[PDB]
């Protein structure tokens, strides 16, 4: 009378849990494949916000790895008169990012967009047909991902050396 | 190599959304009906751990409401000697209770059981075939303590 009884909940419920376990199977093997590419050197890996960003901007990323714990936004700012601009990543916490003055012409800067980092990197991934994988902060692999590698890694299609 | 590109996920994950959509309307069905009973009869609903357990024990609960945000443990200490026994409830946090000695014979009391409140009340509800609903809504967890019941009849309990 107030909750399912025909047992479709239990059915739909069933598949759902199995799929999750498939997820973590994919998330594990993926971190591991990043590791296996890293060890074998190759120069076919990359990790950290700055290093992984530049590869995405040249479509070199085969597989993109992001921790389920990434708490950080990318802030773009632009000068209201001259062509000055800058971007940078700030860890989000409870107001909003500010815009001071132009170090070029002294005019007031203004923030033109804020985007969580996981957004920007998925937009670029999608762009270059990179595969997008997420990694919960549970299994050690997915833990180290955030601990060491800034919670952003990647297996590359080729060695940019970058 | 790392995901479900069969479309299977998309469907089930989505079907799991449609059915969660529904389960929630139902939980509003149940809380609304409890409050309506409370309004034509203050004796045909129950609320609170005390009145509700008393009513389930006597199989007079038509429908039972349990707040998902309920952290509590029912302790049972018996005397290792005389037939003494008590039952108290303890709000949940990160330990396990101890008994001490007996007010009757002075022997050692032992905690013979700890059972999740939701568990006991559930078993209690399975023997009378009462319909069990978990509510998260928060007017339950707060205004009444996350335990409430729509009786099948007025019990004076
Ligand atoms: Zn300027
Ligand atoms: Zn005793």
């Amino acid at each position: 009378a107030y909750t399912d009884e025909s047992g479709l909940s239990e059915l739909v419920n069933a598949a759902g849990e199995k799929l999750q376990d498939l997820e973590l199977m994919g998330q594990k093997n993926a971190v591991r494949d990043f590791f296996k590419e890293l060890i074998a050197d190759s120069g076919k890996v990359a990790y950290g916000e700055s290093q992984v960003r530049a590869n995405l901007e040249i479509n070199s990323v085969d597989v993109l790895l992001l921790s389920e714990d990434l708490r950080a936004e990318r802030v773009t700012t632009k000068c209201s008169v001259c062509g000055y601009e800058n971007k940078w990543t700030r860890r989000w916490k409870p107001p909003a990012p500010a815009a001071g003055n132009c170090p070029k012409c002294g005019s007031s800067l203004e923030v033109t967009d804020v985007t969580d980092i996981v957004d920007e990197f998925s937009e670029l991934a999608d762009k270059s047909n990179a595969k997008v994988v997420f990694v919960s902060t549970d299994f050690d692999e997915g833990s180290q991902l955030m601990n060491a590698f800034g919670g952003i890694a990647a297996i590359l299609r080729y060695n940019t050396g970058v």
Side-chain angles (χ1 to χ4, degrees), chain A residues 59-70:
Chain A
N59 318 301
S60 69
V61 161
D62 187 26
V63 181
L64 174 63
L65 301 96
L66 316 178
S67 191
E68 203 173 297
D69 287 6
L70 299 170

Side-chain angles (χ1 to χ4, degrees), chain A residues 79-84 101-109:
Chain A
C79 184
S80 45
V81 319
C82 92
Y84 180 77
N101 289 330
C102 194
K104 283 293 167 195
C105 82
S107 296
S108 189
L109 303 169

Side-chain angles (χ1 to χ4, degrees), chain A residues 15-32 65-66 68 132-136 138-139 141-142:
Chain A
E17 175 93 6
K18 329 202 166 190
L19 309 149
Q20 277 179 162
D21 304 344
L22 271 190
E23 298 292 323
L24 272 286
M25 287 190 198
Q27 300 186 19
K28 281 188 175 191
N29 292 173
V31 183
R32 295 133 105 91
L65 301 96
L66 316 178
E68 203 173 297
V132 197
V133 167
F134 298 94
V135 176
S136 84
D138 303 355
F139 58 113
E141 307 74 281

Side-chain angles (χ1 to χ4, degrees), chain A residues 29-133:
Chain A
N29 292 173
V31 183
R32 295 133 105 91
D33 289 359
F34 161 69
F35 286 141
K36 291 158 74 181
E37 288 294 0
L38 169 53
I39 311 175
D41 246 16
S42 34
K44 291 180 64 274
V45 311
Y47 43 90
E49 176 187 331
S50 199
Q51 196 198 21
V52 164
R53 182 176 284 103
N55 285 109
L56 284 161
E57 296 178 338
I58 59 174
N59 318 301
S60 69
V61 161
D62 187 26
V63 181
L64 174 63
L65 301 96
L66 316 178
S67 191
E68 203 173 297
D69 287 6
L70 299 170
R71 300 313 199 242
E73 332 175 79
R74 183 59 163 190
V75 190
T76 299
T77 76
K78 306 179 195 168
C79 184
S80 45
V81 319
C82 92
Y84 180 77
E85 98 179 21
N86 76 71
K87 301 173 213 302
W88 52 287
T89 294
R90 78 104 77 116
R91 191 201 328 251
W92 164 254
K93 289 294 300 179
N101 289 330
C102 194
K104 283 293 167 195
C105 82
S107 296
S108 189
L109 303 169
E110 308 160 19
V111 188
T112 53
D113 168 63
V114 188
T115 304
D116 188 0
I117 280 301
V118 27
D119 269 28
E120 171 202 359
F121 286 38
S122 302
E123 305 168 344
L124 305 185
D126 214 71
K127 134 199 155 81
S128 72
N129 251 216
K131 288 180 257 286
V132 197
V133 167

